[PDB]
Structures are given as structure tokens and as C-alpha cells.
Subunit: 364 residues, 4 copies
């Protein structure tokens, strides 16, 4: 572990790994410190949907950033594979956002004006996915809202970043960041290091560093539990989505099913009531799932911020300190764009002023 680095990333989830990759891409000597193992936290719990259309409510900067990031995923798998040998496991079936009421229809048709987004009647959906619930009023088909396995997108970014020279340190938690002196000083139980730039990408745990650097930005965890089953009996190519819940078909034959919303819960293992709730919900969307064998069950903590938006930018009073935390349920989707934006800010390049203002650290 060197004594000085041009840039240091605190956090090895998918956000940190992405940032480390782009920085090393810029031939910037960087190091990444992760408390445990790469992507072993919230990143490993994620379904992996590139759900840009799950947050188009109000076509603001937030949505544009998301669409932009979704486009960045084009060729990313091929790119990262060449350097890491790790497959991100991308599935291009697309997504069916189901409607079970007029209200659902009204919400979903709000985006018919967008391209690649087309409305399907009840009969048209069942024509493509015969086993989807028969209680649907139809569904919005989002061709581009595909999915990848998050853990491997993270591992691919890291391996690639290592092959480009990035130095990665697992089992190395950062205890403190001192902005004193002319260069930043970070302290870890395995030694202290100097850097010209420090990026905070510690997910829901990033609050510690905000406070340390004189900022009140708070993070609240919103626990989500899920399960997986083996689908060896029916065809299912498209992801089924409804009210933030989903059934995504993996290329392994498994179905990743999920999500509960437990605000303020910091525990990372599923409780019985939560799992029962997920099973019940899944059944209303895909009735046959009740006959599928259960594989695994798990949970993760979504990084919730006051306005549900992430903090991606510089420290108000110190351009050497950046932040990239608070991706509630779009972290996998936004990794590329987030990594690119942070990298451009450090490289002092020009960046979209709307996105920069949208995710600024000192928001109202």
C-alpha cells in the first residue's frame, strides 16, 4: 500500500468500483479501500434491472441522467470482459410493467410519448408471456430496461481497474478523512495514505464521512428482502414489474424475485414476514411461481436520502473531496454515468450543468 495516490476511492460497491475503473482509465494513479469484499454489500442484493423508466415520473434531469447511463451500458459488457474475463451476464429480454387497475394504466400511459416504450393490451401481453397473471389490464413494454447481475458488473469493473493499474484494498475500512494540509489524509487500520482527491462511495454508510467533513447530509437505510426460485417449467423472457416489485428471469434458469421496503432497518438478513410478503406478491404476478423450488433468500440496504436522489458531486468548500452516494434503487443503472461524472469532475473536464446541479451536495 503506497503512501500517496493521486486519487482515493472509499467504498468498493458497484459505485466505487465504477469510479476506480474510469479514474484508472484516465491513467490516474488511484487506490480503492473497501471495508469487506468488493461488492459484498447492497450491490450483491440488487436485482440488476437497468430501470431508467422506473423513475421517469417528471422528465427532469434525474431521468435524463438515468437514460444517459442506460445508454452507457451499450458495449460495456464487451469492454469490461476484454480486460477482466468477467461476464456481466446481461439479459436483453426487456420489461413488462404490469397494470392491475385503471390507476396503474393511467400511471403507465403517462410515458407513451417516449420511444421504445409501447403499451400492450391484456391479450398482447399474454401472447408474449402466457403465464403472467390474467388479472392484468395490460402492460407497458420497456425494451431497454434490461438486466445484468450486479455482483459481476462490480467484479468486472474492479478486475478491469486492476489491470489498468488501480490498487484495490479489501478488508481495509477507512476510519477518517483529514482535509488538513495541502493534500488529503485518510486513516485506515492498515496504514494511512495521502491523496490529491478523495471520493466517498460508501453507500448507505457514507453519512459518517459527510459529518466528518462538516456536512449534514443524512442517509436512511430502506431494507429490501428477496428470494430466488428455479424456473424449470415455463417460458419467461421478460421481466415482470409491478409496484416496485419484480420477477426477473436470469440466464441461469433462476428467477430473482422481490422486494420489501423496510425504512430504518439496518439488518441485512430477511425476516419471515418479509419473505412471506414477497412470495405472496410474486404469486399475483406470476401464478405458477408458487410451484417453483426455492433457491436462496437475502436482503440489502438501499441508500435512502432526504429527497430520494443521490449526491454526486464536489464538497461545497473543497473541490478535492467528491461524493457519490444515495442511489436508492437505481445504483446498478447509474454506475456508469456516476463513475464517468465523478471521473470528469476530478479530471476537471466540462460536464452537464443540469446533472451537476441536480445531484449537488448542498441541495435545499
Amino acid at each position: 500500500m503506497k503512501r500517496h495516490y493521486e486519487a482515493v476511492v472509499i467504498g468498493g460497491g458497484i459505485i466505487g468500483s465504477a469510479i476506480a475503473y474510469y479514474l484508472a482509465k484516465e491513467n490516474k494513479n488511484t487506490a480503492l479501500f473497501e471495508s469487506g469484499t468488493m461488492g459484498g454489500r447492497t450491490t450483491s442484493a440488487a436485482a440488476g434491472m437497468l430501470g431508467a423508466h422506473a423513475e421517469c415520473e417528471e422528465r427532469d434531469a434525474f431521468f435524463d441522467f438515468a437514460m444517459h447511463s442506460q445508454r452507457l451500458y451499450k458495449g460495456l459488457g464487451e469492454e469490461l470482459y476484454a480486460l477482466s474475463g468477467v461476464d456481466i451476464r446481461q439479459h436483453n429480454g426487456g420489461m413488462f410493467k404490469l397494470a392491475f387497475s385503471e390507476e396503474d394504466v393511467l400511471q403507465l400511459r403517462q410515458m407513451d410519448d417516449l420511444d421504445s416504450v409501447s403499451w400492450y393490451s391484456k391479450e398482447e401481453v399474454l401472447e408474449k408471456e402466457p403465464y403472467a397473471s390474467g388479472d392484468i389490464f395490460g402492460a407497458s413494454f420497456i425494451q431497454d430496461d434490461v438486466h445484468v447481475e450486479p455482483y459481476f458488473v462490480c467484479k468486472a469493473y474492479v478486475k478491469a481497474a486492476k489491470m489498468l493499474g488501480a490498487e484495490i484494498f479489501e478488508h481495509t475500512p477507512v476510519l477518517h478523512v483529514e482535509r488538513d494540509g495541502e493534500a488529503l489524509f485518510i486513516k485506515t487500520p492498515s496504514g494511512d495514505v495521502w491523496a490529491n482527491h478523495v471520493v466517498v462511495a460508501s453507500g448507505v454508510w457514507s453519512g459518517m464521512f459527510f459529518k466528518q467533513l462538516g456536512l449534514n447530509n443524512a442517509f436512511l437505510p430502506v431494507k429490501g428482502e428477496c428470494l430466488s426460485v428455479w424456473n424449470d417449467d415455463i417460458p419467461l423472457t421478460k421481466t415482470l414489474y409491478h409496484d416496485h416489485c419484480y420477477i426477473v428471469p436470469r440466464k441461469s434458469g433462476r428467477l430473482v424475485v422481490g422486494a420489501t421496503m423496510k425504512p430504518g432497518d439496518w439488518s441485512e438478513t430477511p425476516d419471515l414476514g418479509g419473505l412471506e410478503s414477497v412470495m405472496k406478491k410474486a404469486k399475483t404476478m406470476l401464478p405458477p411461481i408458487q410451484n417453483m423450488k426455492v433457491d436462496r433468500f437475502w436482503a440489502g440496504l438501499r441508500p435512502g436520502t432526504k429527497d430520494g436522489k443521490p449526491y454526486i458531486g464536489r464538497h461545497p468548500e473543497d473541490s478535492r473531496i467528491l461524493f457519490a452516494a444515495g442511489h436508492f434503487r437505481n445504483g446498478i443503472l447509474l454506475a456508469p454515468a456516476t463513475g464517468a461524472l465523478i471521473s470528469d469532475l476530478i479530471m476537471n473536464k466540462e460536464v452537464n450543468q443540469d446533472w451537476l446541479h441536480a445531484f449537488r451536495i448542498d441541495r435545499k
Copy 2:
């Protein structure tokens, strides 16, 4: 693997292991052939309750045999431990059979005349187990219906049997039993062996051997799925039982929760609908369980016979061939008595004629 044995046991579940132990106890040179690993089938799925009072419906021979077997468990743990070093993990808290309706009360009070069985009012139950559902009309407390961990009762029997000279062969399925000649001849993929006595203890798979020996006795599997959670927050000493479902507190801090009933289902892994059903049921009995972290989920196949009773006895036309299969939901409870009865039949000792007639192979 010797060429000849005085007695051979086909099946290494808890029934077979028990039989092998008692036979070796009689200093009878015996061998046991198990398809996979000792106790790796239905025995490993069992809750482990010594539920003699779950089948007192009609105080017939069946119930007496059960009570008798329950008594045999006295000192068994200590006995088997001395020889194997394996702890059966016996928990003596006892059992509360809950009532949620007048009908439940009527069914349960039918046994008030029995000793160690006492009725508890709603308030008396909650006094002992404050977290049991408040919707109960009360419960029948069965002090003796305690529990053990089945897998280890099986392992203890086997180890003990080995220390006494029994030869155990895992990964050795028996393909056929030839009653031709003056001695039985069993064929396995690892070699053939001769024996003076053959005991069929292959659980729900015993049907193959019945047919082979010219008998129509059929076995139907009744799949049961369960789960376990960690109870780190509330006191729970007594087993909670209702309508064949249960919540048994293990000495490790886990709660074994369960059972669905899937007749004709031969699969041994839990399906989503079954697990949801078990969770739902458990919650009505112990509301706080919904907040407990899930540990594992599994399933097993109960050996169902036409009359729900096991076959424990000699082949009608050949006293060299015995059977011990069909313990629907009392296999752990009846292991000792079953093992002792089969051992006595082979040793040509005198045995209870009522039990012998109750479990005969040629029942109506």
C-alpha cells in the same frame, strides 16, 4: 464387505440404524446397506417430536406401542452417547397443543383422563408462554411429548452400532433380494451378500422390496416442507402444536417450524407456495415469529401407507424376511420400539401379540 452376515438391514434412516444397533446389541453379526448417507433422507427432515399424544385418537395398540417407545427414550441419549460420543440433543420443555376453537377443545380434552396430560386455560398458557397467540381457547400440556434432533439420534445409533461390531455401508443401494436357496441373497452394485435374516427399512422406498417378495403393500409419499428461524428475542421453552403444525424450540436458539402435506409429491425440496403456507400458519401460533430471521428451508417424504400405520413384522410366508416401514409422522418416536421389536422377532423372543398383530404385513 463380507460374503455372509447373520442379519442384513436395508436402509440407513433412523429405523434401519435403530434396528442395526439392537441387533449388534444382541451380538448378532449384522450389516446395513444405505443408498446414500446415514439418515440423509426423511429422517433429516423430521422435527424430532416424541409425539405419542398426537396419535392417541382411539387408545388402541398403536397408541400403546407409541407410549412404550416414548418410555424407551428414557436414558437412551445417555446410553448411545457412551458408545458414540454423539449427543441426540434432547429438549424436555414439553408441549402445548393449542386450541383455537371449541372443536379443538373437544378434540384435546378427549385425553384429560391420561396422566402427564393436563388442560391449561388461555391465561395459564400465556403465563408460561406470553408470546403464544392470544386467540387461543387454551391448550393441552403434554409434558412427555419432548423432542430430539433426528439426524443425531440416527448418527448416534449408527456410531454405537459400529462400536458394537455392526458393519455399515453407505453409498451401497440394494438392488434385489432373492429368498431362493436356504439363505437370503441380496445384490448391490458393490457386490452380493448372503444372510440368514433380511430387514427392509427403506422408508417410503420400501415398496420395491415388498413387490419383489410377492407382496402388494404400497407406499405413498406425503411431502412436508419446513423452515427454521433464529429466535434471539423471546422466551420459548415449550413446543407449540396445532393441526399437525408446529414450532419447536431447539437448544441452539433456532425454531424448527412446520409442515405442509403434499400427497403423491416425491420431490424433496420446498416449493414457494408451501413455504409461504408454513410461514402464514406459524404466525397465527407465534405472532413474533414474523420478525425472526430465516435460517434454512427443507422438505422430506413421509412414508404413507393405506391405513396410516407402519408395517413392522415378518413376511407372511418367510420368517427370515422382516419389514419396518411406513412410520407416517411417528418415525423418530417409534425408532426404539420398532428397533427392539424387529430385534426380538429375529432373536425369536416373545413379543407383545397385540403390537405384532397391529403392525402385521398382511393387514386387511
Copy 3:
């Protein structure tokens, strides 16, 4: 489960699965019976190398069949994916068959005349794979001996077959095959069925059927133990191979390492001595593997015939009965060719007489 099927396949490993796929593709009404789960035995333990160049010591019929099957894999993944949505996970890095002595060199140079096969010097190998043992004398590069994940090739075949009309029955062990009427009679615990063609694809367990049908073809298990580690630090694209041992890098970042050779051992879980031996061997081939985190360990039973060659063909005295079992170390590579050959035989199509003869059931 119907009462009649044009073709019945016994055994659901990769061989039985491939067979069912091609039969279904031929629009033949077929059923497959697996005593446990699809691909749950030896198939799930295999490394998945398409090792055709491991059988070229003598360019006979066997080598041709092997090369033929390897070509059949061209595009197989795409084809199966389209129908199953299951990715077989093919890795095209190729293989380095290392040499640690002059004898190794002489033997490996013997295939220099083969296409897509060329010799690499010590320094040419290290140029491609820098972390390979510095003790090598060089290596033969086999571009086509790539690898796949066997379990998924099996699930892909099964799912595809289902989508084409094949009826798959897991947890349905076949007990006996009767040939007395004008059609075969298969008995299972879940009922009996008639068929015009029966194919025995029960791997190392196929012996009971041979014997049941008047054949004495023997099978001996040759247990192979393995383990996997996470390769998060060094590059490795080519499979490393030496003396039947290997280190294969999966697209997930794991290295599948191993194999012990234990004849007569039917146990399917690794013992301490075997794993220690695999670890020791791996270190001689790839030194850095010593510092990699261990992931999993497991074992499988290679189906060994008297000559290490499979039995693929019709029953000498009954052309309605076929066998496809005994693929020692090449069951994955030979799956496509074995499947197509058995299918063609059932369809009475014309087949290569050299291959048909090499895999005869009645080999002297």
C-alpha cells in the same frame, strides 16, 4: 405421466438430457425419467472441458467421434438459448497442455501435425500466461478444447426439450424394464409406462439395467474430487492442463480446479486427503493459486467401463433398447454426438459404422 410414449429415456444427466432434446427435435413423443434432479450427479461435478485432444494419442474412431462432437458444439449454445433462455456459459480461451519434462515434450509434440494445435516454448507460454509455473518446458496450445458449465448445458438441453414437447419426470426412479409384450414396459414408483424405444442413460448406475436385460456389462465408479477458488488478482484466459489435472477459469472469475482418481469409491463428497492432493497439484501448475480464496469443494463419480470407453448403441438382441453410458472423462464433450447418434439409431437413420462399432455393447 401418460401411459404410453414413443421413446423413454432413463437418467437425466447431460447424456439423457441431450438424448431427449434430439428425440423431441425429431418430433418423437418422448419421456425422460430421472431419480433425482436433472444433471444432479456426475454431470454437475465435471469441469466442462471439451477435451477432444486428450484422446488423440491414437487417431482412431474414438478421436474422430470426439472431434465430431466438438464441432457439434459450434452454435449449440445459441440454438439451446433460443429455446431455453439458459446460457451454457462457453469460454473460448483455449487450452495449454503443460510439459514439466522432456518426456512430456516428446509426447505433446506428437500432435504438432494436428490443426488448431501448436507447440509453444517455455517463454512463449509465459508470454500469454505469465503466472503459469516457471518450471514448465513449454506447452501445446489447443485452441478448440474450450469449456462450458456442464450443469447449464444439461439444463439448457432439458428445458429446450420441454419446450419441444418432451415430458420430464424428476424424482421418478425407474425400477425395472420389461421386454415381453410387443412394446417395452417401464416400472416406476409413480406408475408403469409402455414405450416403443427405451434408452438407458443412467451413467455409472446403468449396470442394473444391463443385468436386468441379460447383459453383464460392468460399471465401476472412479471418484473425482475438485474445488474452486476466486481468482481476483491475476489474469488467466487459457485452461491449464497436465496429467489429467486442470485449472479452468470461468467467466465468473472462479477457477475450477482438480481431480483425484479413485476407482471403486461410490461416495460423492470429497475427503481431506483428496482435496489436499488437488491443492498440491494445482500449486505446481499455477503458483499464485496458493493465495486465492477457496470457494467450494465437491466430487463426482466417473462411470468406468472395462476399457474406459462408453457403450453407445442398441441391445444386441433387441433394437428397441439402447444404451448410452460409460463416458469416463468425456461425457460433456461427447454429449451432442452421443445424443444425435442415439436419436438417429431410433429414427433408424443411417449412421457411421465405425463409430457404431467402436461403442458396441457386446465388445468381446
Copy 4:
């Protein structure tokens, strides 16, 4: 989570848990904060030997404390069970400290004068444990150095403490300890709390708190890797021990084997080289272990201080702050004594001055 507590414990390993138990027993309003789950780190990796006779090379204060703690274990299991319903799984077989040379003999004979400790000749050892290595020169039999399952001793302590009123908070990492008011101020992501006494029991991670409070006591992790196997064939009642390595037979039939010694390594999963080394060592001690089925593998971080001794006592400049961390290879054995000592100190009771001095926080 309340706003005030008389005593706060930081860290929920076996040390913090024991401390919380004794404090609760003293009817002190206490809270415990664990960043993950109770006993989830180093405590869960320990073999659980109550190895007091591993510190008798010099019969100083340390050895006395060790012997004292070992006595405290007398009846501890019963006591904790009554309140928690959790079995600590104590095995009283005792321990054989083997000798493989004359030097070993000379060193081990040095404790012949100790009670419940006696020398056994080569043939006397084999008389008790026939399968022990035939290469031994004999062994010292230590009747009292028995073993327990650490995780469960920890869960028992925690549960008992809860039943006595202690408030346990998992997934609640303590970020900072402030000492400025008249009471301590502990900050966590889930809120801040005041306390009259704070105890740092964060194992190898305790260093950040020492430094936070003006102390430079350093901690270095010494990673230990282990594995378990199933002993289903040979007898083994005594724990086998040699050069800090061991083979301990659990009441479940498993043998817990191991330990590597890797200073400075913070990773908690075993690597290939470490496990191979543990397997090699185990075989020299108990040859038959080579054929036993491997169960699991894992690792833990021994908390190493500059002198291999723990820091148990008050903060030199603040008697409201206490520390109990740095139990190198004796954290399980010393749990009862450490807990009682810290509790007595908080209750201002009288304590052994020799022990208090040996574990001083400001050791030269």
C-alpha cells in the same frame, strides 16, 4: 434505543456478550452495540478449547487468571441455559498434548507437578486413543482443558443478558466515543446515547477507540484458518493438540481442525495454501483424518497486541471508560473472568491487584 444507559458495551463478540451478562446480573441498566450480528466475527471461528494449560510455561499472573476463568466455567453452562435455553455444548473429554520429539517431552513434562495434569507414555496414549499418530513419544493429559462451542457460549450470554434487561442492538456500529460532558457520549448511525460507563470490547477492531481516546495501543490481526470433517468411523474423545494446532471432536460427530497463523492478514476467508497446511498438519496428528469427509472451512482474526496479552481495565485518565480486547488465543477461556473483572471494576468492587496490573492499558 433509549437516550441514556448506565453502561454501554461496544462489540458483541463473546467478550462483549459476557460483559453485558454480568452487568445485567448486577442490575445495571446496560446496552450493547454490535456492528453486525452477535458473535459473528472471531468468536465464531474459535475452536472453543478452555486452554488454561497453554499458558503455564510460566506460572505467573496470566496463568492464574486463566485457571480462574476455567473454574468460572464450572456450572456456567447450566446457569446460562436456565436463562437462555441455549446449550453451550460443553465436552469434557479432556486434552492430549502430544509430543513428537524428546524436546517436546522435556517441555511437556515441566507441568507434571500440576494437578489434573499427568504424563502418558506412547503406549498409554494409544491405549486411550488408538488412532493417534504412532509417531508420538507420548503426551501430557490435561483433564480440565475441555471445550465448548464459542458461538453458542456467546448466544447464551447475550440471550441471558436480554432476559435480565440488557438492551442489545445488532447492526449498530459505534462511530465515536465522546468524553467531554460529565457522562460519555456514544454516536451511532441509529442515533446518539449517553452513558456513565463505556466498555470497548470490539476485538481486533478496538484500536480506533483507543486512538479516539488518546491512547496508541495497537492491534494486529493474526488470521487463523480452519476446517471441519465428519468423523463417522473412529473413536476420538480427547482433543489432540500440538504446536498450537488441534483436532477437537464435537458432540455432533464433527472434528474441528486447525489453525494457521498469519499476522497482518485482515481477510476472513481461508485461502488454498492455508487450508492445505492445516490438512497436512492434521494428518501428522491423526492419520485416519485423511479419509474423512470435509464439512466446512473458515477463518478468523485473532486480536494481537504488542505482547500477545489482552488489555482489560480502565482508561488511565478516565475510570468511566474501560477496555477488554486483545485475547490472542484465549478469548473463549477468558470470557467469564474478563466479564466478571470488567463488571466488578464498574461496580467499583474490590479486585485482584495482580490481575489488574497484568492487563494494564498503559503497559510501558
